[PDB]
């Protein structure tokens, strides 16, 4: 299956050093296939960074050589990315990926990616608020609900309705910046017969600050 | 900055020191012989830019020349030391004029890191190759270089990191970064070299020698890494283990926890009400308790006079001054509220 | 450093047209590989070795090109193909990518389903009050949302987000959010979320505080 | 003082090998600098081929390495260019040139250039025809004369009037290629009072055919 | 392979004007060198190290630039400056040149002096006859030549060429050559060389067959 | 070109003659007459061995092919069109193999005219193992060496080589370069050899060797030189004899040809009719060696006295040589005027 898993803090202070980690399973990083690091800036501009080559031997982008160091842990099947003296221009989505040793070989396997921003920050957990329609609202045979998420910074947030049981009719909007806090909202549409009775709860997780809360939508008397 | 640098030439094979000048019709000054009075030509630009970016009106930096001998015409090595920068340069002659071949520079020779944080040593370098190197080069370009980092243990050299085809040694989690600024085929080349040390402990402070290995050339710079840590200060009273109240005179203990430099730590006692006033009574300091994380601790003991009614609501305080602290120092206090019957 | 340039940047198509984007390199290149990336997920390997499909890619995709000019072709576009495609080479020391080419799907114009929401009880206990407004499933991307409180469109305290494009509906969605202070929230009674679309004129939805 | 002079055959049969030589005076090719070969295609597109260094080391354009060879002869102070298996696309004027070893160095000395043609050829010597004014001319105060050089292959053929004595008022027009043959004309202007007096000779030389003919411009009968 | 690009293909200017030509690189380079090339001559080194003038270059020339954008400036265009200018870099393994930039010099319009010449007596002996017409010293470049054999116009067997310009006159010259065969030449008598310029209309010069 | 190649797997060691068994190369039909170890399904990622068969001339015969133990297998394909050498690595049943190195020439038997320049052209393709890319910081095509040697009993004679040129003999020049310098994949390159003004002493067998890290590729070329002679006929006589005693005797001069063997002179009398081979005593002179290696030769013929019926006819010597067309060259002198008096 040869999967890859990025692991990072998501937040780093300027002029400090970041350390990312890629854990691969179902394949050993010492047999073949150079293991790379690729980041995507805001605006969707890919940039290759470097790789460790199954037997050590690091090869880097010439523009980053004075700032990049890639290592690997043979015992744990992990390899790492290190960037020194980061700046606001370094915030991006970082991917680790596999690539063969021949010209017809492509970057055949990618990780899920970790968001990483660089700011003065002070990471804050979010505050999840339910969203129910008004008591004097017109009745349609399909009601829509949601839960507002605000008060958090680091970078990413996840929203899952009914722990993934509600997949269709779900709309999760991107976040916006107010001062130093992010804010996004999620939407779910469900038949009117299946509400009051039977749950519909808004599960929200948020790493970095390490929080995961649930919010039940109900009243609005 | 200045266009002229006074200096002295020493003979390493001793068993003396002559004067000399370095010019970065010229100014004559016939106090030097055309053998130590050198007019420098820096086409790489690393030497001229150093004194161009020099602080305006700063004192003159220390300098020394030596007779370099390349080993696995003549060659003059110039070492310049200053609180602003530390520099090593190689010069080849032809006032006698000379050209600069290799230059190693750092603008932070005294980096001060906070205990437990990451230290970042920075240097740069510039190389101007002779025509013999480009003429003999198949597919010319920047030469391969080595970058080694050592820490002097007051009588022993200890290698930490080395930018490499695999013969390095990485100690204490240190990493080295090094890169030319471009891979152009011709001309002089400039490059960056940095040294990252994680979670610095006071056993890692001291002299750091950074060595640049060019195929037939050597460069060396020195850095003085120093560590600091601010103390955590607290103030609490009472005394002894199973002793009755008042058996011993009332005691105030100002405890300082986890500060490294272990020197110049001054403890002071004040009483703030009725305006302020320096505290009265017997006072002394405990003995240092050396920790494992490098830092230390201390206790200051104060026996004050009995608590009068006029000092109700007034508070006792210990103020502290230390190089790891600003001019105001750090303070701790205890207010005489429900605890003045102990000291009275 | 070989630079790759993708020409169409964005290209529109109705579900059923043949489309083609190009990737022009500055120097000769042996092979150029393509990647399909939908928003929020990592780029998927689409075709390698110029013309070889990666397992799982529909046969309606095809790559071609040689030397310095390449292309990617969809025989008949599909709603599930709405994404950005990147071409990549590794013929020089630093492998590069193209700027991408987004494939926007054309679709019959559809009106949005709007719905307003009063602030939560846990939010008023905190001290703030945010009234949200969802506009779901409309195709014409351009749309204005005006927050009229008894008449005036109140600003300096509102924010809205957008959905890229649905892989099945081929539609868009918006989410306007007006953040207020509690002292200014309970002092008013009207809260209206006005819309503006190329399908009708007016459509409003409101909620009364009392 | 320091000069470079190219030489060699102006015509080469396809699939054969060309060989040019550069002779340099006022400077030895063993002391310093690189010694290069640059060619200019029809259309004024310069292209660098390679160089030989002052130590005999050679560096080539990656597009020509399998087909080029630059040598040198220190006794005659010459370096040579050898292009193997030439084709029609190799037709250009070739320059030899000097450049230092540093990035701020420019190509500071060039040669005059040598025209090189590649085709099935069949060299032919030109036919120089005088161009005299007509019998019914207004003969104002300005007598324009000329000569027509028609019927030659290899492109060159320089043309001078009175061997440099007539320098002003001269217009040497470029040759046009009809079939496999070239043809050009030249124009000279002298006052009407000094053509029936003194001589106005048209000097033509074709180096590839080894001809150097002179044509005295005489009035018609 | 770094590719240089020059902004205008041809820059037209008048004597006394300050005009700027630019050179843009795909990748960053340290220095850019400029060369002046008059036609039929060798490219002369004009500016080295981006801003330094070669020994002999007039002080009215100046160069600047950094990274990937460089420029060449003439503080005062003069007639002897009419040439083609190339930028050159050597930061990669193959040093490349720009496409060139031809500096054409605007000038007051000048009428040409026409001159016709009958076939040479030595030419008729071979078996051919070429009638030469010369169009000398005109600036507006664009010119037309109509050949009139006796009366009708000859639209076959006409070849001509131009000069590139002039370092002193800033004008141009043309040479039309109506070539024929000796068997198809004695059949007609009159031969007229007609010109058409933007100065005046129709300067005709002809010859009578003996 | 052909889709399958029949070959023979040869063995040595025993010294009792080359032992050989059948074998084929499939660029899968069942082959019973071939053991499964000798039936190889070749995989050529560099595409040199495969392309040489796709561009093979249509209707051309099957080229000779033999594999030998280098389980490294070395394939040697020979034909008047191409000489190929390939190295295969291993990993009904069919043993799978992969082509690692392929060195190939399309001029195995070049024929050059005396005085002209010879151009020996080869090409090569290299498929590296993953262990080479995995251990290359700043990776790319490896540096190679390309040496040129002319073989003859006495000593190995290296003429030119790719610069690691520290050779350069007889004015020869070597040309070699990879097709690109891309970091990955298999690489391809060319290797040409130039010999200026080929003289007869430069004839022989030429061996081209590719010098890759821990790898060796080799092909052989057979350079042959020829020179069409100049033929002429004229009356002549002996020098150190009695005045007027020796018979007329014609002289056929064969001037400046190199391949001394295979040249025969023949006489005819073209005018009963024209078909009439000349009668009389004939012989051949010795070879006149020139400084350019070519030789010359004289032919003689003592014909009977010419009658009044042979008037108008003419004698002629036909020259045949491998460097000549099938008709050969012919020179004739006419029996009219003063020649009838001499003969
Ligand atoms: C490192 O290189 C960059 C760009 O080449 C330069 O801006 C920076 O000043 C260099 N570092 C130091 C310490 O000079
Ligand atoms: C190598 O030789 C082949 C033979 O046809 C030719 O096509 C190819 O262009 C050559 N390579 C180079 C770099 O010229």
Coordinates of C-alpha atoms in Angstrom, one line a residue, chain D residues 67-191:
Chain D
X67 CA 30.5 16.6 -33.3
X68 CA 33.1 19.3 -32.4
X69 CA 36.9 19.3 -31.8
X70 CA 39.0 22.3 -30.9
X71 CA 42.7 21.9 -31.0
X72 CA 45.7 24.2 -30.9
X73 CA 49.3 24.6 -32.2
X74 CA 51.5 26.6 -29.8
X75 CA 54.4 26.8 -32.3
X76 CA 52.3 28.7 -34.8
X77 CA 50.2 30.4 -32.1
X78 CA 47.0 29.0 -33.7
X79 CA 43.9 27.1 -32.5
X80 CA 41.6 25.2 -34.8
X81 CA 38.0 24.3 -35.1
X82 CA 36.9 20.9 -36.5
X83 CA 33.2 20.2 -37.1
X84 CA 32.5 16.6 -38.2
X85 CA 29.7 15.5 -40.6
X86 CA 28.5 19.0 -41.4
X87 CA 25.0 19.6 -42.8
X88 CA 23.2 22.5 -44.6
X89 CA 22.2 23.9 -41.1
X90 CA 25.9 24.5 -40.4
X91 CA 26.1 27.4 -43.0
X92 CA 27.2 30.5 -41.0
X93 CA 30.0 33.0 -40.6
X94 CA 32.4 31.8 -37.9
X95 CA 34.3 33.9 -35.4
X96 CA 37.2 33.1 -33.1
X97 CA 37.3 35.2 -30.0
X98 CA 39.0 35.7 -26.6
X99 CA 37.5 35.8 -23.1
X100 CA 39.0 35.8 -19.6
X101 CA 38.3 33.4 -16.7
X102 CA 36.1 35.6 -14.5
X103 CA 32.5 36.5 -14.4
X104 CA 33.0 40.2 -15.0
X105 CA 35.1 39.3 -18.1
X106 CA 33.6 39.9 -21.6
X107 CA 34.5 38.5 -25.0
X108 CA 36.9 41.4 -25.5
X109 CA 38.5 40.4 -28.9
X110 CA 36.9 39.0 -32.0
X111 CA 38.0 38.0 -35.5
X112 CA 36.8 39.5 -38.8
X113 CA 34.7 36.4 -39.6
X114 CA 34.8 33.7 -42.3
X115 CA 31.8 32.8 -44.4
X116 CA 31.1 29.0 -44.6
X117 CA 28.7 27.5 -47.1
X118 CA 27.6 23.8 -47.2
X119 CA 25.9 22.4 -50.4
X120 CA 26.6 20.2 -53.4
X121 CA 28.4 23.3 -54.6
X122 CA 30.0 23.3 -58.0
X123 CA 32.1 26.4 -57.6
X124 CA 32.2 28.8 -60.5
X125 CA 34.2 32.0 -61.1
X126 CA 32.3 35.3 -61.5
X127 CA 31.8 37.3 -64.7
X128 CA 32.5 41.0 -64.1
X129 CA 30.7 43.4 -66.5
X130 CA 31.2 47.1 -66.7
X131 CA 28.3 49.5 -66.1
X132 CA 28.7 52.7 -68.1
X133 CA 26.2 55.6 -68.6
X134 CA 24.0 55.5 -71.6
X135 CA 24.7 57.3 -74.9
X136 CA 21.7 59.7 -74.3
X137 CA 22.6 60.9 -70.8
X138 CA 22.1 64.4 -69.4
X139 CA 25.7 64.2 -67.9
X140 CA 25.0 66.7 -65.1
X141 CA 27.6 67.5 -62.4
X142 CA 27.6 64.0 -61.0
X143 CA 28.7 60.9 -62.9
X144 CA 27.7 57.6 -61.3
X145 CA 29.4 54.4 -62.5
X146 CA 29.4 50.8 -61.4
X147 CA 30.2 47.2 -62.3
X148 CA 28.1 44.0 -62.1
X149 CA 29.6 40.9 -60.6
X150 CA 27.4 37.9 -61.7
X151 CA 28.0 34.2 -62.0
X152 CA 29.7 32.8 -58.9
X153 CA 29.2 30.4 -56.1
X154 CA 30.8 30.6 -52.6
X155 CA 29.0 33.7 -51.3
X156 CA 32.1 36.0 -50.6
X157 CA 33.5 38.1 -53.5
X158 CA 34.7 41.5 -52.2
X159 CA 34.6 44.6 -54.4
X160 CA 36.7 47.7 -54.3
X161 CA 37.1 50.8 -56.5
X162 CA 40.7 52.0 -57.4
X163 CA 41.9 49.6 -54.6
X164 CA 40.6 51.8 -51.7
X165 CA 41.4 55.1 -53.4
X166 CA 37.7 55.5 -54.2
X167 CA 36.2 55.1 -50.8
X168 CA 33.4 57.6 -50.6
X169 CA 30.3 57.6 -52.7
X170 CA 30.5 53.8 -53.0
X171 CA 27.5 51.5 -52.5
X172 CA 28.2 47.7 -52.6
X173 CA 24.8 46.0 -52.6
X174 CA 24.3 42.5 -51.2
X175 CA 24.2 39.5 -53.4
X176 CA 21.0 37.7 -54.3
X177 CA 20.9 33.9 -54.9
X178 CA 19.2 32.9 -58.1
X179 CA 19.2 29.1 -58.7
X180 CA 22.6 28.0 -57.4
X181 CA 24.4 31.2 -58.5
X182 CA 25.0 34.6 -56.8
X183 CA 24.9 38.1 -58.3
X184 CA 25.6 41.6 -56.9
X185 CA 26.3 45.1 -58.2
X186 CA 28.4 48.0 -56.9
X187 CA 28.0 51.7 -57.5
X188 CA 30.5 54.5 -57.4
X189 CA 29.9 58.3 -57.8
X190 CA 32.5 60.8 -59.2
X191 CA 32.2 64.3 -60.6

